Design a protein around this ligand. Structure first.
Ligand SMILES: [Zn+2]
Ligand SMILES: [Zn+2]
Lengths: 350, 350
């Protein structure tokens, strides 16, 4: 397969469906990328892995793919969002054993290289919400400078340039002129994919969607658009409606460990007593393995008993719900009925 | 299949291998019965289930088999070992919501009936270790009276008598005359199986084996012998050498949640730094699913990262190790080489 080939097979309104081809596999889009721990690609947390066991160590152990036994594509973040600051980058000391750490566009790239990622994220500067226009512009401009450094560092490592892909990240907070500036800088540098950054910060769906309505058409139409940190099922459906192709969110896993299950009728809190005698599966349309075999009542019980198996079935369910959702979105766009699906989705979910 | 048919296919010294046939399936012996949460039979905790969700409720929900989705045989304990005392039984208040509870040979039987167990344990009186001969004799005599009440209550419930089986429990602490007395009472009442009770109480392997050497031949040879609460891999091999056919122990699951893995080279503490870069699977001969796919180094990492998946792989590994051990014991006895296996087992395990 090629290093990277994005192809759009069908469209409806702003929504798109198609595929990304890479050496380690094909990624069907719109895509949900679960955390490392039906998916075509998963996410590696660079910041976490850098702290334990370390990037050198993971490289020594054969790379991330062999380490976690996953031989399909992997997307790593830059590590900075999770993180002594300056134009050069950032230095921090580890909480695990006080070791001193430095992150920069160059060092971030090097670390994702050591990890062996297939999709590398440029290193940028988080923009707090809310931000003044002044602060948003200053942060965005530094991010675009860091985007150029990331590109160069990526391109100077032959093995990465030839087998991996680089995404640039749009910043600019919620201001349209800054977003446009950011989009133009990014396209002038040129990347394999364009992420929309800065929108997973407590702004509320309304504002998120507003900023996506003008932000996504600024990005190159023939490249994948990645909405970082998003999100709930209804955020995904609305962002796909606005042109996003890729998503990641800790929601399924965390929800999975704190007793919450996603269903087509809305999220449910399975620890609630109203589920104690409910013989229906987690979700009635879910084709997932948990859903095949066990009832809400038994999972309620598991979790209530503090049994580990319960959180496990819950997480497995949630992960599978998210992939079925993306599958329903792909098929609906491909069939010219995504507009309908979305409306039916909401009526029932809410 | 019959209600209950125990058949001994082969012998070596005191060890036996064969099968138990019941309506819901065949149980190959010597057997390890894991907790509800390769096994031919599992264990239900009666005391726990009685407190949550309740026996009535589980019956309402279709019985334990349908509730946990397990359609093979299930053995339930009496509930008293986990537990206001008198010759009639015992009353206790729940810690979950202060509800008042009573246990007795009759009520224990009724509850295991409501749970739908295939193998029912008579209700007896735990004997603390150490015990004076006087106290051991008094506790044993009450247990044999309770054994007769359990038999009668079991026999007065047509559905149980016809589709389930009852085991009696030998008591008597570590005194041989009491054990013999207990064995004779039990055989005079008559049960489908005979458990050896009172030996999972911190006495140390030496004393356990000593008491098994004279206790097991007192039980009827043509019925299964169940060693309750035992145990570590090396306790099982030695108790099989002394004539036991059935075992249960929380070891695999708990060990599984507290970072400890069983291997043919002894238990390992996977959280230890010496495993951080170990690419070997949990155990090299283990055919288990974890062992297929993941390294000690990645499971070390999982657990160190607090990830739930890790404890899950560990427990799965431990459960599978125990079934492979029982399988190795069955085959070795059937082949006339159990004496050899046991010696080789120890050399490597220790
Ligand atoms: Zn499901
Ligand atoms: Zn294994």
């Amino acid at each position: 397969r090629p290093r990277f080939s994005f192809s759009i097979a069908a469209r409806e309104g702003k929504a798109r469906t198609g595929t990304i081809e890479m050496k380690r596999g094909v990624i069907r889009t719109p895509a949900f990328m679960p955390v490392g721990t039906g998916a075509d690609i998963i996410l590696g947390n660079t910041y976490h892995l850098m702290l334990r066991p370390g990037a050198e160590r993971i490289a020594k152990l054969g790379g991330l793919h062999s380490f976690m036994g996953w031989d399909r594509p992997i997307l790593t973040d830059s590590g900075g969002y999770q993180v002594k600051q300056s134009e050069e980058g950032v230095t921090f000391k580890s909480h695990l054993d006080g070791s001193r750490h430095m992150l920069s566009p160059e060092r971030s790239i090097e670390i994702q290289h050591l990890l062996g990622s297939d999709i590398v994220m440029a290193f940028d500067e988080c923009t707090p919400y809310p931000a003044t226009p002044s602060r948003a512009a200053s942060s965005m401009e530094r991010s675009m400078r860091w985007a150029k450094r990331s590109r160069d560092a990526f391109d100077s490592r032959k093995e990465q340039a030839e087998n991996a892909a680089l995404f640039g990240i749009q910043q600019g907070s919620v201001f349209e002129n800054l977003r446009q500036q950011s989009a133009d800088a990014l396209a002038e540098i040129g990347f394999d994919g364009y992420a929309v950054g800065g929108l997973a910060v407590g702004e509320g769906q309304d504002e998120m969607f507003r900023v996506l309505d003008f932000s996504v058409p600024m990005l190159p139409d023939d490249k994948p658009h990645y909405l970082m940190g998003v999100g709930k099922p209804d955020d995904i459906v609305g962002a796909v409606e606005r042109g996003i192709d890729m998503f990641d969110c800790v929601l399924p896993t965390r929800s999975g460990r704190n007793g919450q299950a996603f269903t087509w009728d809305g999220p449910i809190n399975i620890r609630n007593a109203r589920f104690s005698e409910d013989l229906k599966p987690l979700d009635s349309e879910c084709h997932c393995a948990v859903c095949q075999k066990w009832s809400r009542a038994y999972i309620h019980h598991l979790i209530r008993a503090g049994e580990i198996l319960g959180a496990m079935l819950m997480t497995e369910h949630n992960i599978a719900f998210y992939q079925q959702l993306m599958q329903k979105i792909r098929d609906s766009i491909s069939e010219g009925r995504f507009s309908q699906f979305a409306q039916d989705f909401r009526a029932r979910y809410f």
